[PDB]
């Protein structure tokens, strides 16, 4: 490795740095609350009547177990575009608050429901924010949501004075003002009806039929999570380098015990470096302290290829007693372990004599190729 890090077949006498080492995690643990009640998703997708376009039926999903697999009972899925998050990882996530908006449109405008897009539905009926996160779903409903004479229940806005700000219903039967005649409710020439109706019949085709669309909006931030995926809980392990997934807080640690005095309304913990330090167990409601995982560089002490081919390692600032990483099989060599202030020295003895210094190490110690 020393010959590889610096391009040569002959390394001069001295000390060199090659690479780093880190302790490796052993097992994975997942902790979730006892909440088991299913979410009302199965009702919002499977309903009888949907609202109009200008007045959508916004719903808020409270705390429950959400299974993002029941919605797959709907086969077609004309569009399943997810913007903020990847759909595949939708199951293994936790959200703060979830909004669902369901309504019905025509095919030619199904592509219009997206951030940063303009038109008639996207400007006069429903505008999404540019930084929107969530998913959109659309399916075909011509065969069971149409009449031979047609359905005129659904109407969409066509004329508006000003651009619609995102997430703003505009239910208002105000007569359009055009031309130069101040209409006072005449609703005649130059004063149009803002809402125009639809007609749905089984004789139409794709792009001329009603499609049912539902949009889900999320928000991810440090807050008590109410909606979570159906991932199974696990057990608790302490004083061992493990990776944890506490309610969205994922990362490696040791998870010792703590003596902190968290207030009853606090959840997380921080430090002067704005890094997570302490956590509150979702189920047992105790306080755990998260200290990171032993890591550090390594060094090789060589007397030079001209003399010999025997080396020693200088694991920087890790205790030999517990974690000397115990791959080139030089670990805890018999009678070759020395615990100095610099770190773990493997491959050299420690005599009680004193000579001049050849290869400095640290805190005052020197290595040499002295003969017996």
């Amino acid at each position: 490795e020393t010959k590889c890090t610096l391009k040569s077949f002959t390394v001069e006498k001295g000390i060199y740095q090659t690479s780093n080492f880190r302790v490796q995690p052993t097992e994975s643990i997942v902790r979730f609350p006892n909440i088991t009640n299913l979410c009302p998703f199965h009702e919002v997708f499977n309903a009888t009547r949907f609202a109009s376009v200008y007045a959508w039926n916004r719903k808020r999903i409270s705390n429950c177990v959400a299974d993002y697999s029941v919605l797959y009972n709907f086969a077609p899925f004309f569009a399943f575009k997810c913007y903020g998050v990847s759909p595949t990882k939708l199951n293994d996530l936790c959200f703060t608050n979830v909004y669902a908006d369901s309504f019905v449109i025509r095919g030619n405008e199904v592509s219009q429901i997206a951030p940063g897009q303009t038109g008639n539905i996207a400007d006069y009926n429903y505008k999404l924010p540019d930084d929107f996160t969530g998913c959109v779903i659309a399916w075909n409903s011509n065969k069971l949501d149409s009449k031979v004479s047609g359905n005129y229940n659904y109407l969409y806005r066509l004329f508006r004075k000003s651009k619609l700000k995102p997430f703003e219903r505009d239910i208002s039967t105000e007569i359009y003002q055009a031309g130069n005649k101040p209409c006072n409710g005449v609703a005649g020439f130059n004063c149009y009806f803002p809402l125009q109706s639809y007609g749905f019949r089984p004789t139409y085709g794709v792009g001329h039929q009603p499609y049912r669309v539902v949009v889900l909006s999320f928000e991810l931030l440090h807050a008590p999570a109410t909606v979570c995926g159906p991932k199974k809980s696990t057990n608790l392990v302490k004083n061992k380098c493990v990776n944890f997934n506490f309610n969205g807080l994922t990362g490696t640690g040791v998870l010792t015990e703590s003596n902190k005095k968290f207030l009853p309304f606090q959840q997380f913990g921080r430090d002067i470096a704005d890094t997570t330090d302490a956590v509150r167990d979702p189920q047992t409601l105790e306080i755990l302290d998260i200290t990171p995982c032993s890591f550090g560089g390594v060094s090789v002490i060589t007397p030079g290829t001209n003399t010999s081919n025997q080396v020693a390692v200088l694991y920087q600032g890790v205790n030999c007693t517990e974690v000397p990483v115990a791959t080139w099989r030089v670990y805890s060599t018999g009678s070759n372990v020395f615990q100095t202030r610099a770190g773990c020295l493997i491959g050299a003895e420690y005599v009680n004599n004193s000579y001049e210094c050849d290869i400095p190490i640290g805190a005052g110690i020197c290595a040499s190729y002295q003969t017996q």
Partner: protein, 236 residues
């Protein structure tokens, strides 16, 4: 009957739900400025009522020292009419009957020489829970309990913080420091711009918040003990 006084150093609340110790963290948010002008309202009808509707903007700091249950509830919303959506809060002995039912009239006292929500048509979210206004009595009236509340709403949700202080012993808005622990954070999407208070038959402060930058100090127990403004004085 409106009197005026000095708000002193008051109205500091925990901005986030995290734990910090021995930190000098500084944050920018809606706060009550130091040494602001607080209006001491006054009314009495125990000799209908003698108070019009107060304006609401950027939240309200509300403090009072009542006897047992004289002042109970609050009314929020626009125009306080049964055409728009309004919020009601009533604090009785055992529960809170907070609701977002639509109403315009909810009180027919008729003091001699309930009738709550007289017209409630289309109700909405309810959050019945433990009562807010509770007091402990040491069988002496030397120390009058002081109750402080902060109401605000930003990007959804209704944030209500509160604190009790038995330290007061005869002064209005005393010198000292006391942070407010969060109590209620419930979700409502209605639009609020007008504010009024209730009163029980058979003392009243109003403030206003502004966007300011504060610097707060935490102790080793995680409790805020001091805070400084960054616009009041050049030394600050």
């Amino acid at each position: 009957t409106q009197s005026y006084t000095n708000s002193f150093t008051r109205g500091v609340y925990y901005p986030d739900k995290v734990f910090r110790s021995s930190v000098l963290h500084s944050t920018q948010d809606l706060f009550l400025p130091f040494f602001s002008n607080v209006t001491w309202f006054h009314a009495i009808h125990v000799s209908r009522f003698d108070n019009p509707v107060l304006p609401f903007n950027d939240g309200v700091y509300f403090a009072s020292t009542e006897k047992s249950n004289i002042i109970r509830g609050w009314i929020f919303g626009t125009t306080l009419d049964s055409k728009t959506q309004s919020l009601l809060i009533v604090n009785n002995a055992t529960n809170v009957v907070i609701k977002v039912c639509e109403f315009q009239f909810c009180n027919d006292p008729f003091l001699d020489v309930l009738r709550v929500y007289s017209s409630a048509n289309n109700c909405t979210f309810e959050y019945v829970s433990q009562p807010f206004l509770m007091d402990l009595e040491g069988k002496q009236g030397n120390f009058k309990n002081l109750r402080e509340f902060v109401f605000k709403n930003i990007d959804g949700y209704f944030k209500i913080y509160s604190k009790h202080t038995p330290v007061n012993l005869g002064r209005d808005l005393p010198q000292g420091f006391s942070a407010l622990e969060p109590l209620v954070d419930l979700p409502i999407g209605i639009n609020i711009t007008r504010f009024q208070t209730l009163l029980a038959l058979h003392a009243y402060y109003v403030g206003y918040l502004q966007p300011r930058t504060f610097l707060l100090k935490y102790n080793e127990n995680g409790t805020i003990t001091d805070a400084v403004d960054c616009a009041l004085d050049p030394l600050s």
